[PDB]
């Protein structure tokens, strides 16, 4: 059997909405195990200067109990059935989800509905999770890759809300109050903005049924059915350089303004980003890798690692690359890169893309390797695209892309655009916005 | 036929790089391929090629050659590199035609 077909056998993903706003979806399989979760469209992006750090302080207490069943009870009851409860919270998309046996499909949902709605919030627990977050910072601070990407945001979108750290400020995490935490949950964790997704050996109906029972809260005024539209975030060409010649390597991150979730161009862009791909010391590939930059990177010991990225958001997004190198090769590297970027906008060939496509193709396929990741695709899809995009579709959208397409889009988003720059470390060899700007044209 | 074979032998004594003790492949001009090949040579074969040249060089500087009895003889000439080279070249030819 051919690939084209295995693509259309994948069971259409089902969806239905409750008259209160919640939306429920899930892909049925045969597996005895599965994963289910609530995909809230919340995050620091929705936070302000006084409450930076709620989505997080919350994500921290969403697992220490509810009012029905305190600390131990919650954990106990969950552990005792083998399920797995994990969660996260980006700038504009928080999420709580559980992995467990299809048998417990219902009992699970009950719990999910209990964290999102009846979160405990014990005063003894908060003043304890306060000391902890404060620690996950002293630590998260030493993860250059992330210390960079935050800075990238902090100046690329500088001045706006997007330009904030998810973990929030040190002062905020020191003063947030039971009160402030409450509001965040109250003001943000609302059904029309939440999504119940799951995948595994579950029946669609069975699932929704549970929803109807615990995700009650039916609304009166039109206010509650309305999705507060967000203020635009201004991109700004600029740089922020944090130096410390005491660090072993230096991280650099360059970027342009992304298109925003909706745009059909993101496809082309991802096709592009595949052409340049990524590299890293251990790659057995070596000097034969296909990525020009990867190849050069190797031949001249340019860098410990580099990567392309296409972070997308509701209205905007970041697009570029990040590499780590020795203080004495930051230059050469940067240069090779900005060049490969140019190459894209000026002479990408049908071969360069043919490979890129096939790559992207199986990458997107591996995005659906298991229940949790499949679920995540749905949670995120509904919340961002407003429905579910089948691999059959994704694939067709890729088969469309050819050289000409890429060349125009990359030019469209890269060529002669003021970039956002964030560097961290013993970064003296790389030294000029101007010179970098100058590298944004001709190739 | 046995013409090219009696021709080659002549030319060989004609070029006369044997007078210096240099094998056929000692006199090869070192382009990129050769360079590459030479690096693939087994520890010894290389250290040996080395001496021969540093010795030939010493000759050309003194303006003398080797006594008749030490010259390389057309049939005892070992093409120690020809194989490694054809491989380098074969390898390269690939990379090149593949980039289309």
């Amino acid at each position: 059997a051919t690939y084209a077909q295995t693509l259309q056998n994948i069971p259409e993903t089902n969806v239905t909405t409750l008259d209160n706003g919640l939306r429920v979806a899930s892909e049925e399989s045969s597996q005895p195990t599965c994963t289910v979760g609530v995909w809230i469209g919340a995050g620091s992006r929705y936070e302000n200067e006084k409450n930076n750090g709620a989505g997080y302080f919350v994500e921290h207490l969403a697992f220490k109990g509810t009012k029905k069943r305190p600390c131990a009870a919650f954990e106990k009851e969950v552990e005792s059935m083998g399920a797995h409860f994990n969660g996260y919270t980006s700038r504009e998309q928080t999420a709580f989800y559980i992995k467990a046996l299809s048998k417990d499909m219902p009992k699970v949902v009950e719990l999910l509905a209990d964290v999102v709605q009846n979160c405990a919030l014990e005063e003894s627990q908060i003043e304890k999770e306060r000391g902890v977050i404060l620690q996950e910072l002293k630590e998260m601070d030493n993860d250059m890759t992330n210390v960079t990407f935050d800075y990238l945001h902090a100046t690329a979108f500088q001045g706006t809300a997007l330009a904030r750290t998810v973990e929030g400020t040190t002062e905020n995490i020191k003063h947030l109050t039971r009160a402030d935490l409450a509001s965040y949950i109250d003001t943000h964790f609302k059904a029309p903005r939440m999504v119940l997704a799951a995948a595994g050996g579950i029946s669609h109906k069975e699932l929704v049924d549970a929803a109807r029972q615990h995700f009650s809260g039916v609304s009166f005024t039109y206010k509650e059915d309305a999705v507060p539209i967000l203020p635009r975030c201004r991109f700004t060409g600029s740089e922020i350089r944090a130096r410390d010649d005491a660090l072993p390597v230096a991280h650099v991150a360059l970027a342009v303004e992304g298109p925003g979730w909706a745009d059909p161009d993101n496809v082309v862009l991802h096709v592009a980003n595949a052409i340049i791909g990524r590299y890293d010391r251990t790659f057995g590939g070596g000097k034969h890798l296909s990525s020009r930059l990867a190849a050069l990177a190797v031949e001249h010991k340019l860098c410990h690692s580099f990567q392309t990225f296409n972070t997308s958001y509701s209205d905007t997004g970041l697009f570029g690359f990040h590499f780590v190198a020795d203080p004495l090769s930051i230059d050469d590297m940067m240069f090779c890169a900005q060049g490969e970027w140019m190459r894209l906008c000026t002479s990408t060939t049908e071969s360069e893309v043919k490979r890129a496509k096939n790559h992207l193709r199986s990458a997107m396929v591996a995005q659906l390797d298991g229940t949790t990741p499949v679920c995540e695709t749905i949670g995120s899809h509904l919340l961002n695209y407003g429905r579910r995009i089948s691999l059959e579709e994704w694939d067709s959208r890729i088969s469309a892309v050819d050289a000409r397409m890429v060349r125009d889009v990359c030019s469209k988003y890269i060529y002669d655009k003021c970039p956002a720059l964030a560097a961290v470390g013993p970064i003296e060899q790389l030294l000029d916005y101007n010179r970098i700007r100058s590298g944004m044209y001709w190739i | 036929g046995r013409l090219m074979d009696r021709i080659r032998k002549w030319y060989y004594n004609a070029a006369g790089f044997n007078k210096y003790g240099l094998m056929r492949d000692d006199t090869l001009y070192e382009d990129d391929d050769v360079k590459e090949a030479l690096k693939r040579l087994p520890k010894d074969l290389y250290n040996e090629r080395m001496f021969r040249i540093k010795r030939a060089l010493d000759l050309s500087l003194k303006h003398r050659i080797l006594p008749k009895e030490q010259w390389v003889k057309y049939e005892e000439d070992k093409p120690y590199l020809e194989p490694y080279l054809k491989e380098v070249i074969r390898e390269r030819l690939e990379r090149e035609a593949w980039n289309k």
């Binding site: 059997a1 690939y3 295995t6 693509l7 056998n9 994948i10 045969s30 597996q31 005895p32 195990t33 921290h60 697992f63 600390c71 131990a72 954990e75 106990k76 969950v78 552990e79 005792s80 059935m81 083998g82 399920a83 797995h84 409860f85 994990n86 969660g87 992995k99 467990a100 046996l101 902890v132 010391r281 251990t282 057995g284 590939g285 070596g286 034969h288 890798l289 296909s290 490979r355 496509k357 096939n358 790559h359 992207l360 193709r361 199986s362 990458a363 396929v365 591996a366 390797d369 298991g370 229940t371 949790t372 691999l391 | 690096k39 693939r40 087994p42 390898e91 690939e94 990379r95 593949w98």
Partner: protein, 421 residues
């Protein structure tokens, strides 16, 4: 076509073929092998390791180049995975390309040329490949444990030792392949494929004869301690004892006693009360730490114990508490219900491991190579609940009596010696 069936032929030479078409848009073929750093002798150490990185090196039918460019051309991937006793070569890709990715998968594991230069030009990588992994103290202590709990084979380190970097040879590698990667020790397991293709290919292309090639030095147990002072902030520690072999029905006991003591968290930033060990430690320590149940099962042996991680000042009590919690567990302090729970956690964990295409191809493989059989998911779950509260209280006892082996690393200033437990 939802449900198909799992086939599994076994050619004359002993080359087990495991298929399974699950109609996923992508296949994942592999070559499991009875190989590893357990067949290494003093004189040829790490030659296992290098062989792992030597994967992309030219073969009699494809160049270091063509292999990498040829596979990337389809959005493929090639990776080698190995334990002390099992290597796993496997490619992944889209269905319509499996045909081509195979040539290399085959060529790599059956016809390597190991050219003198491509090799000596690749050895420095060991220095590196090794340096990255070792950033995790997690792995450093394991290396030592094995060497501190064995006399041979399994004691051999998984990453080529430092002294031998750069001294491995082309011959050394070869004799390690001719003498181990033999048809009777190989298994061609594959997902998203028809058993007809996989078989046809396995037979018409494969050569290298069968035979255990070179038997492995039976695993002799030692039981010593290896303490590594390094000034580092946290103290890692693992105290274990001879465990079970792969397949012994006794092994399922520990696998349950594993979960009974608490072998990992299930709730992010959790407290894990279903963890005797964990909770058992918190009732002794004040500052942040972490403890869990250690368990490994090897063909002719295995290990079992706990692994801690703590501040250097409490390192002691945290380990001692780790023992007393294992004793009070080996002595009738196991609720017939704790046992009922660990059974689900175990049924679960296993089941979720079959979700990732990689996780499945591993279960199918291991089994399909150590016996050429495949125990249905309902049978395995049967050999699990077939556990008695006794088998458990015994597993816990088989521990407190036998000779123990220890391993550490960090400011072991206030840490304890094996003889003080």
């Amino acid at each position: 076509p939802g449900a198909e069936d799992l086939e599994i032929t076994k050619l004359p030479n002993g080359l087990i073929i495991a298929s399974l078409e699950n109609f996923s848009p992508a296949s994942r073929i592999g070559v499991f092998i009875k190989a590893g750093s357990r067949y290494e002798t003093t004189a040829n150490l790490g030659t296992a390791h290098l062989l792992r990185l030597a994967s992309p090196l030219t073969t009699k039918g494809a160049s270091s180049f063509r292999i990498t460019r040829g596979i990337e051309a389809v959005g493929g991937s090639l990776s080698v995975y190995s334990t002390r006793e099992k290597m796993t070569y496997c490619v992944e890709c889209l269905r319509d390309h499996v045909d081509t990715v195979m040539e290399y998968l085959l060529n790599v594991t059956t016809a390597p040329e190991f050219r003198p230069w491509e090799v000596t030009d690749l050895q420095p990588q060991l220095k590196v490949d090794k340096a990255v992994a070792f950033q995790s103290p997690q792995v450093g202590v394991l290396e030592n444990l094995h060497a501190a709990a064995y006399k041979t084979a399994l004691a051999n380190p998984l990453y080529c030792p430092d002294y031998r970097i750069g001294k491995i040879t082309s011959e050394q590698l070869h004799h390690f392949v001719q003498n181990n990667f033999t048809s009777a020790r190989m298994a061609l397991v594959g997902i998203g494929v028809k058993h007809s293709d996989l078989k046809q290919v396995a037979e018409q292309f494969l050569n290298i004869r069968s035979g255990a090639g070179t038997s492995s030095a039976k695993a002799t147990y030692w039981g010593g301690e290896i303490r590594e002072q390094n000034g580092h902030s946290l103290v890692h520690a693992a105290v274990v004892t001879e465990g079970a072999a792969v397949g012994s029905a006794e092994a399922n006991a520990f696998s349950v006693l594993q979960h009974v003591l608490g072998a990992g968290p299930l709730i992010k930033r959790g407290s894990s009360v279903t963890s005797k060990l964990y909770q058992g430690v918190a009732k002794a320590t004040t500052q942040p730490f972490d403890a869990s149940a250690f368990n490994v099962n090897y063909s002719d042996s295995g290990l079992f114990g706990f692994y801690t991680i703590s501040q250097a000042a409490h390192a002691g009590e945290v380990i001692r508490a780790a023992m007393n919690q294992l004793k009070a567990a080996a002595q009738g302090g196991v609720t017939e219900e704790d046992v009922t729970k660990a059974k689900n956690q175990l049924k679960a964990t296993y089941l979720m491991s079959v979700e990732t295409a990689q996780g499945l191809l591993n279960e199918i493989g291991s089994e399909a190579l150590l016996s050429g059989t495949h125990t249905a998911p309902s049978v395995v779950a049967q050999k699990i609940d077939s556990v008695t509260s006794a088998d458990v209280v015994n597993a816990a006892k088989k521990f407190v009596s036998g000779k123990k082996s220890m391993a550490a690393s960090g400011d072991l200033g206030s840490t304890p010696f094996l003889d003080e437990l």
